[PDB]
Design a protein around this ligand. Structure first.
Ligand code: 0V7
Length: 658
């Protein structure tokens, strides 16, 4: 079906455009599709792009509108006072504003389907909502519609929700076009998706992106594949990876680097209403916060992530217990058996499960995958699936058996309910990953483990040294390996905060000189410096010229390979805002070789100051472009939970930044 109306190049300059004559008598039947290509790089706080209204006295609540907010939220209202219907459907963080300083053409498709009683909205090729109702209201079946309007809604003869922007193309159809037909509509996106809803991970949500450029030129990305909405652990989360061999143009189907099987990998539409949005998968083990590095010596890729046993997050993790027991020099994972009230077992050498009460070995062993064997025979547990069919979250057995893992709720032997760090390696640059190993405790038997800083580890250019930053109360705890990650030692660096989420990322300014940038609770990004390849660390300083919120946001950083303005250059990625996670910037700093101080000379705004930007990953692509994979939404805001396809990838050149 071809359009019943088609128009274009409308400038919305705080003055509505009447298209009633052109459109109203074209609308027929109960199903409609609106296709609109529009720009708004300077939107008003709340504005309507398109309206169908009853403009008469006493019918101010009889209208259909497509509206947007300066937060990037998109939505519709469908209202009829006589029918007593006031529908409002929307999703935050659905829009782009600007890319490389030019207004982005957003492609909006809204489908109003009378047969399925469903309203569906897509923006930039992403389905942002699909709502089914019991009582369907066709958009031109509103009582007394007499105006079709661009850039406002006409209510009682006056202009409401006046817009600033432009509509380059608008088409309407007297049909609810299919999901297939929608897929064929040309897009003008400034971004790409690496991970996305419906891909091989089957997670509907993603958080905590990473990027790392490998020596072969392959670019590797890791991420939290988050199943139970966007909630941190406790939840179900796996670590997924994807790579690009063509400088970020295309990406491989994801595989898992770290995954648990105690709960099904389910693509679930997590509820966003206030009563249910804090529903949380409460009995699954999870991985969270990955970080990547490449080792030149072995050629291996190394990935670490936090590990959380069933039902555990940072909120309830046993502080005061590492989960290991010291036996004269060595660290052994503790285990609690079904029915015991204490942890009377340890995993000794060769995975042998050992009874600490009688110093006796058992017939149980723990394999490489942390699965429980009895006499060489693999034990199993029944898997769980989750659903909201009952009206609340239900977690229940699904009839499938999976290998029994000591991180599981249903396991015969269970680890201490605290946080761990695991490592996995790849010998094929991310085509497959090994079974993970737990790192040993670094701060003692009675200290819970540190938290990995997501993003990149650091491979010093002039040596074999590998470093992963981690954080805990009162310090950064750098984990250092000189033997391809086979053994690790810690290097502790005091910071003047208690309990900070001090997510830290490192750059090598020059041989042996490391600057670490980190999240604080002060509203400023901090930094410290090592001049001996991470053995010792300076006191903490703060960057002026960038603002973060009181709670802070992860910051990513790289040392650029090429000189800028004749100087060594560092690039920082972070929100720049004291209010929320928004106003994303890449900030280019030039190093003063007199004292290694940095002058933050260029600020590149990734999109509008009001549009969301949270955790991020940055890398120098082999062609010297800059790749950025980032949460394009406010991942703190309690209004922006459980959004799909907001972690997005862009390609930039240094001349775009400067
Ligand atoms: O600042 S945010 O709230 O967006 C993310 C912080 N997540 C920290 C964390 C890290 C490891 C395990 C957890 F349960 C939680």
């Amino acid at each position: 079906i071809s359009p019943i109306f088609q128009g274009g190049s409308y400038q919305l300059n705080n003055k509505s455009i009447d298209i009633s004559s052109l459109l109203l008598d074209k609308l027929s039947g109960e199903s409609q599709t609106v296709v609109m290509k529009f720009k708004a790089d300077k939107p008003n706080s709340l504005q309507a792009l398109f309206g169908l209204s009853n403009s008469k006295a006493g019918f101010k609540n009889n209208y259909f509108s497509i509206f947007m907010r300066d937060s990037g939220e998109i939505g519709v209202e469908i209202r009829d006072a006589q029918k007593g219907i006031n529908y409002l459907f929307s999703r935050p963080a659905s829009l782009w504003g600007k890319h490389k300083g030019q207004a982005v053409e957003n492609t909006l498709v809204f489908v109003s389907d009378s047969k399925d009683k469903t309203y569906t909205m897509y923006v930039n090729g992403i389905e942002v909502f699909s709502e089914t109702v019991d009582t369907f209201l066709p958009i031109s079946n509103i009582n007394g519609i007499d105006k079709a309007t661009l850039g406002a809604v006409n209510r009682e003869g006056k202009e409401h929700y006046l817009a600033k922007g432009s509509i380059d193309e608008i088409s309407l159809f007297n049909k609810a076009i299919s999901d297939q037909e929608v897929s064929t509509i040309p897009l003008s996106n400034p971004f790409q998706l690496i991970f996305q809803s419906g891909d091989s991970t089957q997670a509907n949500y993603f958080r905590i992106p990473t990027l790392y450029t490998l020596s072969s030129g392959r670019v590797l990305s890791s991420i939290d594949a988050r199943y139970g909405g966007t909630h941190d652990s406790k939840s179900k989360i796996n670590i997924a990876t994807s790579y690009s061999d063509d400088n970020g143009k295309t990406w491989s189907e994801p595989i898992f680097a770290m995954k648990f099987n105690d709960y099904e990998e389910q693509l679930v539409y997590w509820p966003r209403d206030n009563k249910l949005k804090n529903s949380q998968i409460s009995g699954s083990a999870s991985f969270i916060d990955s970080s990547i590095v490449e080792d030149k010596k072995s050629g291996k890729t190394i990935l670490l992530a936090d590990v959380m046993p069933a039902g555990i997050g940072n909120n309830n993790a046993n502080k005061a217990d590492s989960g290991f027991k010291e036996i004269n020099g060595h660290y052994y994972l503790k285990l609690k058996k079904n029915g015991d009230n204490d942890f009377r077992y340890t995993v000794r050498e060769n995975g042998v499960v050992y009874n600490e009460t009688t110093n006796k070995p058992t017939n149980y062993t723990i394999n490489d995958k942390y699965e429980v064997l009895e006499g060489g025979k693999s034990l199993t547990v029944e898997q769980y699936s989750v659903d909201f069919d009952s009206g609340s979250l239900r977690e229940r057995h699904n009839g499938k058996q999976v290998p029994m893992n000591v991180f599981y709720k249903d396991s015969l032997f269970k680890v201490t309910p605290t946080n761990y760090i695991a490592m996995t390696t790849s010998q094929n640059r991310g085509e497959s990953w090994e079974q993970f190993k737990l790192l040993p405790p670094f701060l003692g038997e009675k200290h819970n483990g540190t938290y990995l800083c997501p993003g990149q580890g650091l491979a010093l250019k002039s040596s074999n040294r590998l470093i992963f930053a981690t954080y805990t109360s009162g310090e950064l705890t750098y984990l250092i390996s000189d033997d391809s990650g086979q053994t690790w030692k810690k290097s502790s660096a005091s910071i003047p905060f208690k309990n900070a989420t001090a997510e830290a990322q490192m750059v090598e300014l020059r041989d042996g000189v490391i600057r670490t940038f980190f999240r604080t609770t002060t509203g400023k990004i901090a930094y410290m410096t090592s001049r001996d390849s991470g053995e010792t660390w300076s006191k903490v300083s703060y960057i002026d010229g960038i603002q973060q919120t009181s709670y802070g946001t992860q910051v990513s950083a790289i040392k650029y390979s090429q000189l800028i303005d004749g100087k060594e250059a560092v690039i920082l990625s972070t929100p720049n805002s004291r209010s929320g996670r928004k106003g994303g910037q890449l900030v280019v700093g030039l190093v003063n070789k007199e004292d290694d101080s940095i002058d933050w000379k260029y600020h590149y705004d990734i999109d509008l100051p009001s549009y969301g930007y949270a955790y991020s990953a940055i890398t120098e692509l082999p062609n010297h472009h800059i790749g950025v994979l980032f949460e394009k939404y406010d991942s703190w805001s309690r209004n922006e939970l459980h959004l799909s396809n907001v972690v997005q990838y862009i390609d930039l050149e240094i001349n775009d930044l400067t």
